[PDB]
């Protein structure tokens, strides 16, 4: 009998490439095993080396911890300090211990990017942006020295919300109002001034933390609830990394689980990206395995290559047409191309804090003929068509401009049409909520882009509801 | 049974996936024609990065032949680049994605020109040249292409694109200008289709059907049958399909490759080594089983001194009475042509780029560049001919000698070619002076004997001796 | 039966980071073994590939050398040349040989630091300093183009003392006045002009060295003393590197030795650095091992992370609270963070040449928003608080400034509070000897920061005395 | 069983750390001279990048011995570089291509001079030097050569080029001015000939016949015969012809190399280690079966403390009764001469570059360069002598000690040479002052005892010692 010690070191991810990358589902499933397991009597969270996860993922680990607590097992969180990310997770604890010289470091959210128009003018770089989408702002750095007013309003909307969800969640976890979790900068400074700059008393007096206590006082309290081990020389516990997650029994009705974790590129899966052909081959696999009864596509992608996306879409559409229901589970990001790949699904579930939509399209051509000219380098040559002088060192010909603008207008019509046919809508109605506008899962649910607010559990349960009643999971991490 | 799957990945080259052998491709297609077990060919070219035009036309021929035997050839893809499509266009039936494009845009050349940079940097440029159209020296002395260079390059690029269009025309049975109507024409045809590139391709018959990956799968499994084992239509990939190792008759024709720039040393990097190549020819010239030689050339040229070593072993072979046939495949220019000179017979593809009979040297020194940052040189010499280095002014004595050496090198080139192509030096001038020529223009002015491909050069070789043969490679 | 050959190559360090790095303790313990081993008849020091050690440390080897000597075995020093550091050790020898054309290179001590206020202004960099410590001088590079007067005064005091410590020790070893070991630059110029720029004659007439000889003569003289090995074709000797130090008998009753060597980092160890978690775990092992009766913390550290220092301290404090005495042994440096961790001990011993103190706290933030703006690069984005809006490419928001300044004021108060509670003093008393001021072990002892002046031997002896009996060392 | 083919590839060196040992070459020619399996030598030096004149002359000497036993030596090549042709000229017969060139052009010296740049960067330079002719220091202090340097350098380069001419003139039995007439003459001679470089070479007797590569292979078989196995003329490459390992007589002469710049530690790179060489000399001194020591030197010099370590060991081997003879090969200057002073006897090639008895040191600091970009250094020091970092000005006390140190170093140097050369510092001063001296100048002024080569060094060591000897190396 011991505690499960959650000494997560590193980041939380959907799928890999004291480890630096930790699987969200492996963490949750281990916690749930710990729940039913007679030999574990509690969890301790030691999050010093934990670097963070997206809000939808951390909320999921949280859900597993509430389920754990609701069984009547204690969950403790200990540390000298908490970053904003560690505290979010720690907030789901029964009880939070802080060092008497420690800080709870709550400071808000911020987005930040470089803008280079002025530098491009000075280098005499020639820039061409082809885009459809007033709010498709990844383009702005080449053509502004600042974010556009449209970009500003879309980005304020989402970030302001993701942060309210941070506060509402943590507030509820701690049972104090949101303004007390974080009162803003004026109030934090006022609070910190009473306590004479003591961050830990501010934390204790405002209920962010339950007790201040040294590392040895913590140990005494932990051995008292969990007992002492003569072999280990500590309180009785076993680390996440040594606790064995029992490999689940296989039924025969399986639900296939395919990851789209990362930027979507054209070929095989390289780096930490999605490869169109690798993912399409994993989908094909489940589509032809008679054992596999439904597919869940777990998406965490900003997007990427339009040809890559189409290839993946095609396959999911074939799976569903083969009579295997497709359910998308969105976890953090499923935007642009990552929304593109989700469209053929029977059902789309997103986390309220998920970032999605961004239904729009862009392309950027920079050329350097003038930059080279100014230092006396030129290019010259012969061609059979102006359509053939497209190169970084040559001016973009107007023929190639015309084709590029037509290509991009056509691709945008493609996108809103797919979504229009997928979402039981009209290309004209989709235009009203597209134009490159990024939406949180909450907004997307409100405007039709997503079907229900939830998590991977909800996606799986739904895929199972489109057929039968004892399932197990086939993953394609291979 | 099953299809042969031509899922070529990478480039085509004479002599090494990523590098694929032209000859293994052609011979596998030819073996698959006679193989009861192959019932057709599917081309999947998505990872195929191109080849030169002669080479792809060669692979075409083998596809036409496979086709002429009654077996089907199919092209499938989401999209086609201009390289992929040339090849695919040999297929009976071309399948495009309903959102795909066939991306035809023409041919273009492009190079850096630096006269002004070198002047700003205060570099001294020394040019030694014979050839108005030997234009590869222009970047050092111009900011743009010379009017002469522009005519020469427009000529051959013009021809090569026409060759592209005509072949693809003939392959699709539609007029050349419908294959590619020019920029305006392409714009007008895309407007009319709402910018649907695939509808454009289908209405102009670039392609035979629009269809999805799993629509193509089905249509392919109907034709080739379903494999319970692989869970796909019946097919073996070219990379897994064993090409049979041909029998040693006992009378052979040696094939030697001069693939790349020609270097003095031995076979380095992706280059031709004068001495490795000379030795491969020596091997063939003295093996009594070898009845003739085919020199398969694809080279921009390079080292004149290494050119001679190769040329001399070739002449030796011919002098001992072994016929030497050159098979040009893509490029055989300058020194690629220098080593080709002693052959009994010279064959180029019409799209081959050859000639460029001319000579040049460039010296850049940096004395003034250093001087302006306060770095100088000094020393003693026993002759100004000794004072020759990147950091010092080029001595006028050194200039006179280098000029003389280049004038002489030029005379050597045209004399070699005059002797070898049954002309006079003065006549070879009128068509040398650095000018690049396509196989067609070369044939027309005597530099080349006939238009064809490797098949014809082999055939000519066996015919300059006698009648049953196998190939020996080195 | 040979000489012991101290042909040391590289530097001396408390703990080699698994020659180049030679262990202080292995050297000292091998000389002591060689004193009682009838197979070793003397020591020969060949230091041409010896790149230095800190002064407390070479003093400590010196002490082993004096002990070897006092037992009646000779110590000889040999070189074509002596660098300033090589000569310190050499000077403990009975007799020093120098090449007839060689030099004893004594020149003094010097500090040297870069200062780039003017650069940062030309480069349009924004600088933000959060400091408490008038002599907490490691900030001056960002805000000045030269030392502040306060910084000069403090650095002059310690550098002066350490160079005097060097002269006084070397003088004593050679039995000549300290001004004759080194007369100043003017005196050296004088002694050398009188000699025609001949450094060996200077050295020999001023008694820095005992005799002048080529390698092939010294050889002769040394085989006279040690006898000739026919097998090795050389005088009878064995190198330090081949001569086995014996692993001491095991008692049961141990004193544990934990190293705090280098910059103090938050992680675990990996580098040439101290890792908070790694050092705490070592201290824990020793704390819970009933075998271990006392702990010695061997410190040589410029400092580093406050939070990692706290981790180390808390384990030390717990060790002491559980009844195991903790004795600090300060080596070359034990300053700032390296003093923080020393604070919980029953007893602090430093070498008089140790640099310690430096009780203060600092913070520097540079941002590059104006540097980017001048080349047409800009940042922009959205935030829910200015507190979130902190990174190298943005202006430091006024709200963040106020928070960092509170933080620094509070960190200084932590520090002096800790020190005042540990050295039976008041916070207001420690301020008068804090303010970031660096002090020698001697100035440290005189102001209460340190309990006694001595070396490693004195720290061990004290640890044993705070418990009892006969001991031996568990290293970690 | 055929020609020894010297298809030397790379460079000649004293000791290989591409690199061919000078002695392995000489000792293989001498073995082949007396081996009845070798009927001749063929020199194929297309891949030979050169060696110093003294070394090539040494190989030439063994070629002459080889030729005098009546076995022929042939030189074959498409071209001859200046280095290559020096060697080829020791052949009975020299064959050139009819397109070939003999590239004779003289000698040059050239160096960078940095003063202007150093002042532009505001660098502070402190030069400490004794020796009007110690010119290695001139790039730190000026834009160009001082008249002193250009006199010293014209002198030795002139002499080395004339030795080149004289040797090659003797080898070809034509007068020197015919070998290379100067720029004017070469250009005229190449004009009475249409720019034909081979015809220039044949008419002026640089070369014996112009001949195709196959015309050479025909005359080379016939003389050496044909091998049906190798399918060439009978022949074995230098690299495959085993040099037999000489016996252990009973009395040895130690050969110790000092090849390259002299550094302070152990041997690294292509440099001399003061302590490494010393241990070698020391093993020599103590191994009772070594009766003499030869120090083979090819060094521009380097570190004085490392030179002294070496000198002292050698002086000790001599005092211990073992004679020391120096063989200079190419360079033995500065420290390379310091280390040579203990010897009973010094032999230099007339083309050896030695002397340079002189001393210098440079300190550069960057306080003003850093000042101008707004970086400064500050700190506390207990003496001005402790402020000696590159970012600090050099303090006046340190300048004075440095000058006094260099003054004393030069005194030590002319003093060592005075003792060793039976002279006085006053007499040595007249021939010191940093002045570089060829072998011949050094023999005339008394810095060297005789002109000769490794063989003479060895013979002289055996004479001072006695009897029948083999060589022991390290």
Swiss-Prot record, chain A:
It comes from the Bacteria. Its EC number is 3.4.21.-. Changing residue 136 to A: Loss of activity. One of its GO terms (molecular function) is endopeptidase activity. The active site is at residues 136, 336. It is a single-pass membrane protein. Homotetramer. A tandem duplication in the protein fold creates an intact active site between the repeated domains of each monomer. Digests cleaved signal peptides in vitro, its in vivo function is unknown. This activity is necessary to maintain proper secretion of mature proteins across the membrane. Belongs to the peptidase S49 family. This is Protease 4. It comes from Escherichia coli (strain K12).
From Swiss-Prot, chain B:
Its main location: membrane. This is Protease 4. Disruption phenotype: No effect on processing of liberated signal peptides in vivo. It comes from Escherichia coli (strain K12). Its EC number is 3.4.21.-. Keywords: Cell inner membrane, Cell membrane, Hydrolase, Membrane, Protease, Serine protease, Transmembrane, Transmembrane helix. The active site is at 134 (proton donor/acceptor), 334 (nucleophile). Changing residue 334 to A: Loss of activity. Residues 1-474 are periplasmic. The lineage of its organism: Bacteria, Pseudomonadati, Pseudomonadota, Gammaproteobacteria, Enterobacterales. Homotetramer. Changing residue 111 to S: In strain: ECOR 16. Belongs to the peptidase S49 family. Changing residue 219 to T: In strain: ECOR 38, ECOR 39, ECOR 40, ECOR 49, ECOR 50 and ECOR 65. The chain holds residues 56 to 549 of 618 of the full protein.
UniProtKB/Swiss-Prot annotation, chain C:
Disruption phenotype: No effect on processing of liberated signal peptides in vivo. One of its GO terms (cellular component) is plasma membrane. Changing residue 113 to S: In strain: ECOR 16. Its EC number is 3.4.21.-. Changing residue 451 to N: Increased activity. It is a single-pass membrane protein. It is found in: Cell inner membrane. The active site is at residues 136, 336. Coiled coil: none annotated. Inhibited by serine hydrolase inhibitor FP-biotin and by antipain. Belongs to the peptidase S49 family. Digests cleaved signal peptides in vitro, its in vivo function is unknown. This activity is necessary to maintain proper secretion of mature proteins across the membrane. This is Protease 4. The gene is sppA. The chain holds residues 56 to 549 of 618 of the full protein.
């Amino acid at each position: 009998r011991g505690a499960l010690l959650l000494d997560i070191s590193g980041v939380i991810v959907d799928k890999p490439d004291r480890l630096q990358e930790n699987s969200l589902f492996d963490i949750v499933n281990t916690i749930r095993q710990a729940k039913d397991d007679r030999n574990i009597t509690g969890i301790v969270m030691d999050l010093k080396n934990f670097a963070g996860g997206d809000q939808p993922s951390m909320q999921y680990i949280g859900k597993a911890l509430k389920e754990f607590r609701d069984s009547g097992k204690p969950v403790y969180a200990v540390g000298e300090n908490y970053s904003q990310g560690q505290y979010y997770l720690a907030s789901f604890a029964n009880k939070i211990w802080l060092s008497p010289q420690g800080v709870v470091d709550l400071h808000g959210f911020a987005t930040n990017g470089l803008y280079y128009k002025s530098l491009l003018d000075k280098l005499k770089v020639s820039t061409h942006v082809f885009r459809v989408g007033t709010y498709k702002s990844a383009v702005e750095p080449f053509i502004r020295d600042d974010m556009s007013p449209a970009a500003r309003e879309a980005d304020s909307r989402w970030i302001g919300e993701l942060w309210q969800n941070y506060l509402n969640t943590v507030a509820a976890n701690r049972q104090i109002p949101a303004e007390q979790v974080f009162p803003g900068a004026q109030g934090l400074l006022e609070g910190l001034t009473k306590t004479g700059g003591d961050t830990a008393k501010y934390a204790l007096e405002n209920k962010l933390v339950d007790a201040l206590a040294s590392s040895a006082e913590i140990e005494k309290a932990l051995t008292k609830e969990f007992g002492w081990s003569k072999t280990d020389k500590n309180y009785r516990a076993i680390s996440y990394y040594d606790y064995a997650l029992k490999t689940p029994a296989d039924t025969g009705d399986s639900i296939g689980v395919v990851f789209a974790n990362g930027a979507i590129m054209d070929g095989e899966e390289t780096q930490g990206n999605v490869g169109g052909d690798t993912t399409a081959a994993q989908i094909r696999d489940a589509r032809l395995d008679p054992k596999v009864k439904a597919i869940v596509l777990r998406v965490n992608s900003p997007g990427g290559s339009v040809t890559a996306s189409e290839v993946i879409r095609a396959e999911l559409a074939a799976a569903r047409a083969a009579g295997k229901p497709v359910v998308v589970s969105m976890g953090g990001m499923a935007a642009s191309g990552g929304y593109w790949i989700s469209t053929p699904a029977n059902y789309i579930v997103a986390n309220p804090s998920t970032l999605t939509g961004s239904i729009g399209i862009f392309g950027v051509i920079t050329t350097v003929e003038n930059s080279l000219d100014s230092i006396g380098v030129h290019t010259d040559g012969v061609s059979t068509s102006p359509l053939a002088d497209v190169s970084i060192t040559r001016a973009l010909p107007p023929e190639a401009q015309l084709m590029m603008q037509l290509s991009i207008e056509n691709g945008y019509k493609r996108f809103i049409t797919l979504v229009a046919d997928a979402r039981h809508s009209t290309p004209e109605q989709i235009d009203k909520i597209a134009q490159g506008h990024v939406w949180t899962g909450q907004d997307a649910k409100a405007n039709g882009l997503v079907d229900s607010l939830g998590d991977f559990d909800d996606a799986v349960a739904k895929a199972a509801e489109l057929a039968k009643v004892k399932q197990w999971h086939l993953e394609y991490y291979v």
